Amino acid sequence: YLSSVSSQETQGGPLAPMTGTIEKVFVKAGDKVKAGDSLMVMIAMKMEHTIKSPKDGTVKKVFYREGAQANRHTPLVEFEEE
Amino acid sequence: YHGDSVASLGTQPDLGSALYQENYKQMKALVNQLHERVEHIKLGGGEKARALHISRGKLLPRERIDNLIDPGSPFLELSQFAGYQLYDNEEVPGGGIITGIGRVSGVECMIIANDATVKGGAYYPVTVKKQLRAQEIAMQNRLPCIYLVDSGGAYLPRQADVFPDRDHFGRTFYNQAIMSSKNIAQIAVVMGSCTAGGAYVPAMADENIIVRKQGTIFLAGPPLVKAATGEEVSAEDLGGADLHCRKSGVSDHWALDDHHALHLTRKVVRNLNYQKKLDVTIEPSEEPLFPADELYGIVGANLKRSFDVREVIARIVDGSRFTEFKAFYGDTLVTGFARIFGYPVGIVGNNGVLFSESAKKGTHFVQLCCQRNIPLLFLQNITGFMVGREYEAEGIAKDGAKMVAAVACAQVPKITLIIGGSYGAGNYGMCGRAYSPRFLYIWPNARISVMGGEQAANVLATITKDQRAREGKQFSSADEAALKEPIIKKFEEEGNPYYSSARVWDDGIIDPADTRLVLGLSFSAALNAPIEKTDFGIFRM
Amino acid sequence: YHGDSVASLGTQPDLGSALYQENYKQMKALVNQLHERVEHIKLGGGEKARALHISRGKLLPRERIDNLIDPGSPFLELSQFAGYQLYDNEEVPGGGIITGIGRVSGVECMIIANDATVKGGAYYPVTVKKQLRAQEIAMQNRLPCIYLVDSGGAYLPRQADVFPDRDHFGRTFYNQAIMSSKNIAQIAVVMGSCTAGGAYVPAMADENIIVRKQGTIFLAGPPLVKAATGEEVSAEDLGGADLHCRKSGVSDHWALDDHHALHLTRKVVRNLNYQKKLDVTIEPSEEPLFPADELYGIVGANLKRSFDVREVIARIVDGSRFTEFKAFYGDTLVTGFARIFGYPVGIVGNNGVLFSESAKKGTHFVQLCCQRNIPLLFLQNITGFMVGREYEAEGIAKDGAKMVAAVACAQVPKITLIIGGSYGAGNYGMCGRAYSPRFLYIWPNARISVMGGEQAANVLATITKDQRAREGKQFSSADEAALKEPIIKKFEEEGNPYYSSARVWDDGIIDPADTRLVLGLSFSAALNAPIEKTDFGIFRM
Amino acid sequence: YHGDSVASLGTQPDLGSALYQENYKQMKALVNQLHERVEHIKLGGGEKARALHISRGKLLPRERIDNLIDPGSPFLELSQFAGYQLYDNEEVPGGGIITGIGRVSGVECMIIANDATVKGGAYYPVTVKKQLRAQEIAMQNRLPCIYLVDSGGAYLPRQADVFPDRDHFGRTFYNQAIMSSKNIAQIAVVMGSCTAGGAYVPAMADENIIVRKQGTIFLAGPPLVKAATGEEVSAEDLGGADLHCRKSGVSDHWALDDHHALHLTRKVVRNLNYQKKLDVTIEPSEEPLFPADELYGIVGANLKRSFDVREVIARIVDGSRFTEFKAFYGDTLVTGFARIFGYPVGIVGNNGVLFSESAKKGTHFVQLCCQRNIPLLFLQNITGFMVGREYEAEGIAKDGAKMVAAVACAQVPKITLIIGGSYGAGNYGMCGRAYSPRFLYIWPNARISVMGGEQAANVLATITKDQRAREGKQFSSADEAALKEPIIKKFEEEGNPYYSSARVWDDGIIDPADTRLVLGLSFSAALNAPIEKTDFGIFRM
Amino acid sequence: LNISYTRNMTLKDGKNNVAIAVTYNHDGSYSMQIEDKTFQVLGNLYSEGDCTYLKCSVNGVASKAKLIILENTIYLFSKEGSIEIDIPVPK
Numbered sequence A: 001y002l003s004s005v006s007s008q009e010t011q012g013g014p015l016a017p018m019t020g021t022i023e024k025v026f027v028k029a030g031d032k033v034k035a036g037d038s039l040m041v042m043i044a045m046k047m048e049h050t051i052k053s054p055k056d057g058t059v060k061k062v063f064y065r066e067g068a069q070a071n072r073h074t075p076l077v078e079f080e081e082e
Numbered sequence B, C, D: 001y002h003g004d005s006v007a008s009l010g011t012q013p014d015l016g017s018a019l020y021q022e023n024y025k026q027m028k029a030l031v032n033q034l035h036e037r038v039e040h041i042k043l044g045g046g047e048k049a050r051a052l053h054i055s056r057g058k059l060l061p062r063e064r065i066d067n068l069i070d071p072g073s074p075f076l077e078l079s080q081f082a083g084y085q086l087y088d089n090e091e092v093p094g095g096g097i098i099t100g101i102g103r104v105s106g107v108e109c110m111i112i113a114n115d116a117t118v119k120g121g122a123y124y125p126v127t128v129k130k131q132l133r134a135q136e137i138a139m140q141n142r143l144p145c146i147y148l149v150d151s152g153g154a155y156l157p158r159q160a161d162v163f164p165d166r167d168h169f170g171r172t173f174y175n176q177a178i179m180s181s182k183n184i185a186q187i188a189v190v191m192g193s194c195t196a197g198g199a200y201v202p203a204m205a206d207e208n209i210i211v212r213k214q215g216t217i218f219l220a221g222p223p224l225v226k227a228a229t230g231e232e233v234s235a236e237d238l239g240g241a242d243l244h245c246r247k248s249g250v251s252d253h254w255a256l257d258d259h260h261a262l263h264l265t266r267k268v269v270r271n272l273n274y275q276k277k278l279d280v281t282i283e284p285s286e287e288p289l290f291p292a293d294e295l296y297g298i299v300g301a302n303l304k305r306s307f308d309v310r311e312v313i314a315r316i317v318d319g320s321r322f323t324e325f326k327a328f329y330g331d332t333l334v335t336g337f338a339r340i341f342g343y344p345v346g347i348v349g350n351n352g353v354l355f356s357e358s359a360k361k362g363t364h365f366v367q368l369c370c371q372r373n374i375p376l377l378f379l380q381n382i383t384g385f386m387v388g389r390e391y392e393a394e395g396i397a398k399d400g401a402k403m404v405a406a407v408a409c410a411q412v413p414k415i416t417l418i419i420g421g422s423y424g425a426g427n428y429g430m431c432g433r434a435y436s437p438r439f440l441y442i443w444p445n446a447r448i449s450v451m452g453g454e455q456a457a458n459v460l461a462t463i464t465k466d467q468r469a470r471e472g473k474q475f476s477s478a479d480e481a482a483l484k485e486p487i488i489k490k491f492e493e494e495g496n497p498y499y500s501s502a503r504v505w506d507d508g509i510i511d512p513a514d515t516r517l518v519l520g521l522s523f524s525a526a527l528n529a530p531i532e533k534t535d536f537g538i539f540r541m
Numbered sequence E: 001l002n003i004s005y006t007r008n009m010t011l012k013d014g015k016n017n018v019a020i021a022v023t024y025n026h027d028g029s030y031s032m033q034i035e036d037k038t039f040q041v042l043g044n045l046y047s048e049g050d051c052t053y054l055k056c057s058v059n060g061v062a063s064k065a066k067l068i069i070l071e072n073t074i075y076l077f078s079k080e081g082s083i084e085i086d087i088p089v090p091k
């Protein structure tokens, strides 16, 4: 714990942070994504949240289209592992 | 043994004197104008707004207050003139809110009710000031608060004067929480939709009552939700009494309509389990020996003339009995002991310019009253404060400071009434607003300013002339007139009682004939809280 | 035993990132602009006024403060931007008064000095507000007050905003008397002529020092005496240190010049017989592990982007050591324990929108800190407050009310710092001005409003459109634009940090690189008073 | 003003329903059995023992109590079933001691009288427990104690359970001394010979009364003196009222017989110089609107069926008036305000399984009652505590902890009544014995256990099966039956009200038709002590 | 303060609901408006024996009658007529 080697042990998949409009979508239905790749940019309550790519896996499909309302904690991208 | 015969104050005025006739006429005209303006304010926001409000099946705020308090009980409304011509083109009757002290289930309570007919209940800065003043009064006098909430949140165009500062909208929630922590009951009745901000009021209250399909609590309204997040939802599904009672838990009681909500509020106030206890001696009440309307003749409307404050004292105290203290020292100040509705009071009134002896006498009397735990009543009629080389050599300012410190450090209930002028540091020395009296009322003939208009004009003219002479520049008489006249006009406008009451600088303008009654009520409301001991600073001898 | 190795916060930022470069550039430009404006304010009232002031043999107020405090001691000046563009055509540098916290004779003291070069020391409304804020800080933190009095009384043209109300000029004397009654020393040094009102300040002070031929106390100046009574007399004969010391008794010490007066003031402060006692645990101080200037890159000037508040925490706390509390619940709020200059602090900072879990976590942490008597530090960076149908069904407003009540009822010292946006009821929930923090500072990139400009414009447009539809009247798009654009512009102007600091809505704008230091000083000044027990209201579960 | 019409609870039950008939029959049988057992216990130790006791010219303990208290005054006896079948072959009626609350000289007092007909007044462990419980009640409610001492000391064969521990015989003297130090009067009347231990009771009492030739105080009896030292002496010469009054000074009053001793005790209680003061609001009493015997039909004896607790509330409160709080949130819990004999009470009762909402509502109501200083009444009818994965994810345990902490930290008088089942942590959450209620009564149909018998059997069977599977050993069904059946039988026996009342786990089993009356008495006895302020722990939001 | 309190009362005379506007005058009298007509009413209650009598003057016409209020009903017994008035019950 002191060395913080196991600090980053937690892993998870992408999810919607909040309920609000979706400003932009950067992920196609079928594509290969790398680490840190922007998935979607969502504007809610005078604040823009950018969703990063968790792993390097390819995307099977996207769930939300341009300018849609996405509820909080809802899947956005069907994501494959590394 | 209380059978000793005691001489009484008061003399029969000369009703045939022309001065009495003129003074009576002027005061009657002033009172009639005040009554007409009060009626127009009572009319409310407007006819169309009232019709729409009734069409929704809701009661007007004054009807709500009438049905809430005990039957036939008197109601003491505060700051009826808030917002009177305060804003250039917007009419805000009563400040858009109604604050008062009433009797619910035999308990003195502070009722604060939003007026939904004035801009949909939006909060103007004067509305926030009025609500904060009412909350401060309730805190000081330890009175339960009842908020009949029907508001549209802060008024957006004036947001810079409503949201951010210390004495702005957040102080309402701060006071609510603080008074909740001191076992002072908070009851919020949600009579209508609260868009935002007002949704916190039921949340922070000790007990809630909400109407079924009228009251709807939501942190952000459907327009605000659409603007911020974009989600679309109806008001009832966003708020609603059913949706709040059933799973949210915000609401504590569920009411069919306004009448049921008021009945539930009365039941809650009964269940409060509180009993008033008095820590002062009580004697049987007795009416004064002279009619109160004669004050119109005695006082009049012209401030240039002078009258004996003993006339007012004899017209307001019980049985016209008054025990003067140090009658011949500092004659310009009148200090003594009396009783109003059985409550003992120490009366301090002005009868001229304040001298060193008057300040010393006032300090001594304030010390005595604080020692004996007796409420204090101040009557301000200030021609000015004594100024002069021989007075400065005798420390007239230091005696004024003595009186100011004594008044400020006092802990007994203090009630101020401005029956005439109030200028300079004399206003501070006679328990002005800055010194936190429990109540402050003014008569329709009062005048309040830093000084007279002509005095300020002369001071400014002398300053400018001396500065120009030192610079070496000519200062013509036309410049003197151009400097003087606007100052005279501005000081004339800003001294009007209606100007001072539009802003919350007092608790209302009162008919002199009602004075006694009002005082009684106020003193009653002042006796709910226990009287603490008084700690004084350094008396600069 | 305090030898356990503990992990530290903070990560090394990417100095090569373009985002870091842009943020650093923007923040550096903002800081440079702030420094230039502060320099211009420090210049004073004007060159001719300064020359005249020096020609009278008097010291400028900043020189007085420098010669008063202990050598090399830091000075914490408050509200340097009061009056900045507050009035349309009048320039009032620093509000015409200088308030700060310094160290005199090893004792933390509040110095309030009038600036005679700004309109002859006349009191603008903002000057009264600044002095009242300084007096309130001294009262809360139990700090002796020193008034370097050189004033021309109230500013007559603005008298209606200076004289009559509760938070107006009389509150100064009220606070002076009250703090005198609580064994909080008041020392008044009369460095110059006081026309009126300011003459009461030495009278109500515990001890006085007056310069021989500069300081002159008189209730009414020769112009005022001429205007009121008509008597003609010179200023020295009306006031004067000799004429006051010898027979008036108002003055307590007699000084040859300003230097002698400051020496006497230091002697009095030494004779105060006071000793600071700490009621909190103390640990050796330690510097943070990262440079403070990197904050410029981390934070930047654009509020649309977001940053981790843990970076700021690691850059300000001692040794970058931080013990997070409930790290994974309510991740949008960061609560934990740290130490600043050895003082233990509980840090609560924003990392996103406030949810129900965040409010519950904040309430729990505030309860813990109040129980353990630990000072609280709030870091406001508020994107907004969560709103929505499912959140209203879960009582998001009621959780916000929980947090608001917990913050309001707290009795431990509270210090708020606004590092980003501050909108809506989130400002109330994070210890805004209305909730009486001991200090409140903002960074030069902050924004404060009731809500965003576009949100308010949309709300107003929707309200108007719905009202017109109900009435049956067309609401065109040109009307929408005419309603929206002025609201957008007004909200843009009123949110500026300089706009919020011109009025006394905070204690100054601070360079981020100085943040730590300022906090330290503030917390030191916050520890003079003992910490009382905390009484909470009803926790609406 | 208390003239508002208020709706009342209660509905007329269907007397023709077969369910009502069956429930009435079962409850009537239970009450008849209880009455017969109480009569047999009242008979006393035995016929020969009573004859011998009378032959010595002494009064039976119940006659002593009847002649001590005021005429016609009700007597509230506590723990009439202590020792009922507690020991295998020894019969100990009433635990060998009689404890109760009565009215002596207009003062509520706690009477503790030893029964000399049960093993010569020897102290069984249950006797010590009963006396300690009575002393604790007197300490909590600030009631004077009267000890009618006629005892043979500790029961030697059970000495290991009587002498050494903290809650053993020495705690009696400890409590006596402590209550003496708090100005709670102790009066000991030595009605008979005290062999040992009991000789300390008059010594530590504030005032003593001893009968001439019956009461004899000696530290060691003639048998004990012979066994320890060998000295031979008669009982009268070793003790005796003459030999104690004349030169020992242990005795304070000298009585001819029991009647004279009781008269002297009444005189002393009159000379106590005490006056009861009430710190709660009082309203005129009013009977309920429904007969109390109908409860027999409403409740019945079968715990599988469920009934509305509002029926019981309407049958016990004054005028059947009840103000429900948060009626629709957490419907499984019923919380509200009512009055019993004019005393205001906050009623919290169970109506189903405890959910998160019910726990939150209970915490809120307990906070309100503590804030307003209102006594609390709990009605336990617990089917269980809600458990499950979704409930654990929502912190059902943490909400139960909230309620438990709120109940534990309460300082207002608390009275618990178990009208049905009481299982699991719900018993703790509803003010069980461990949380120190002022009184605790159960109905003759209650059941108390850690959980149901079948639930415990299933838990144990699953544990054993999993352990055997992990070990790799077969676990047959015969083993399951052999593990289950004894557990079922034991849980059935240990849940009986008589089993729970044989040990001092409550203050007695009460006829439901008497419930109201008992509560009244208890609440009266609960109001002797002043109500202190309540300090709460950390509310884990 | 500065205005006169007006109370709206509803009374069910048999099967007809009637609304009365009662204005509380300063001198202790009342001004009752029922539809178009307005009336000046002033009276008091005095108890003789076990019977409470209302002595009232309406528009200058004086009278007295035994007054009993029981269960949402008001009974006035006089020497010229007996009057029963029903007080409406809230929902």
Ligand SMILES: CC(C)=CC(=O)SCCNC(=O)CCNC(=O)[C@H](O)C(C)(C)COP(=O)(O)OP(=O)(O)OC[C@@H]1O[C@H](n2cnc3c(N)ncnc32)[C@@H](O)[C@@H]1OP(=O)(O)O
Binding pocket: B116, B119, B120, B121, B122, B123, B151, B152, B153, B154, B155, B156, B169, B193, B194, B195, B196, B197, B198, B221, B223, B224, C424, C425, C450, C459, C463, C467
């Ligand atoms: C954090 C904190 C502490 C606080 C906040 O965040 S506060 C956030 C913003 N508030 C809301 O989000 C509530 C938005 N209202 C509404 O959702 C509704 O409107 C109701 C609920 C008010 C009912 O409305 P209603 O039934 O009374 O009718 P309406 O015609 O609408 O009533 C009059 C009309 O209201 C206009 N109007 C002007 N200013 C406002 C205003 N400030 N609020 C509402 N209405 C306003 C007025 O100009 C016009 O009349 P006019 O001047 O044209 O003649």
Ligand SMILES: CC(C)=CC(=O)SCCNC(=O)CCNC(=O)[C@H](O)C(C)(C)COP(=O)(O)OP(=O)(O)OC[C@@H]1O[C@H](n2cnc3c(N)ncnc32)[C@@H](O)[C@@H]1OP(=O)(O)O
Binding pocket: B424, B425, B450, B459, B463, B467, C116, C119, C120, C121, C122, C123, C151, C152, C153, C154, C155, C156, C169, C193, C194, C195, C196, C197, C198, C221, C223, C224
């Ligand atoms: C009850 C309570 C609580 C309070 C009171 O009752 S308060 C009563 C009234 N006050 C006095 O009675 C003091 C009157 N001053 C004086 O007796 C002197 O003047 C001194 C002492 C101020 C020294 O004066 P100084 O040596 O500093 O020079 P001066 O040029 O005079 O300084 C700048 C010039 O002062 C003009 N100026 C504008 N407003 C004021 C103002 N309010 N007071 C003074 N001067 C003012 C300014 O406009 C011009 O400059 P400008 O704007 O033209 O460039």
Ligand SMILES: CC(C)=CC(=O)SCCNC(=O)CCNC(=O)[C@H](O)C(C)(C)COP(=O)(O)OP(=O)(O)OC[C@@H]1O[C@H](n2cnc3c(N)ncnc32)[C@@H](O)[C@@H]1OP(=O)(O)O
Binding pocket: D116, D119, D120, D121, D122, D123, D151, D152, D153, D154, D155, D156, D169, D193, D194, D195, D196, D197, D198, D221, D223, D224
């Ligand atoms: C430090 C502390 C804090 C404490 C101590 O140190 S405690 C020291 C020891 N106690 C004494 O030293 C008192 C010894 N008693 C006596 O001096 C007398 O006996 C009297 C005074 C009790 C009057 O006696 P009595 O007139 O009531 O008649 P008795 O028949 O005697 O009454 C019934 C019979 O008593 C038998 N019996 C059984 N157990 C005891 C017991 N514990 N005490 C007394 N008697 C007991 C019973 O079994 C039999 O009847 P049974 O069961 O055979 O039917």
Ligand SMILES: O=CCCCC[C@@H]1SC[C@@H]2NC(=O)N[C@@H]21
Binding pocket: B383, B384, B385, B386, B387, B423, B424, B425, B426, B450, B451, B452, B455, C196, C197, C219, C220, C224, C228
């Ligand atoms: O009050 C008005 C009379 C003329 C001015 C008197 C001045 S105002 C400044 C000073 N303070 C006082 O109380 N009186 C003088």
Ligand SMILES: O=CCCCC[C@@H]1SC[C@@H]2NC(=O)N[C@@H]21
Binding pocket: A045, A046, B196, B197, B219, B220, B224, B228, C383, C384, C385, C386, C387, C423, C424, C425, C426, C450, C451, C452, C455
């Ligand atoms: O804070 C700005 C985001 C958009 C507005 C949110 C509103 S302001 C009224 C209400 N109170 C809050 O704290 N949030 C919402």
Ligand SMILES: O=CCCCC[C@@H]1SC[C@@H]2NC(=O)N[C@@H]21
Binding pocket: D383, D384, D385, D386, D387, D423, D424, D425, D426, D450, D451, D452, D455
């Ligand atoms: O109460 C009996 C129902 C079945 C057992 C419920 C268990 S007992 C352990 C735990 N604590 C509770 O309050 N309920 C569960």
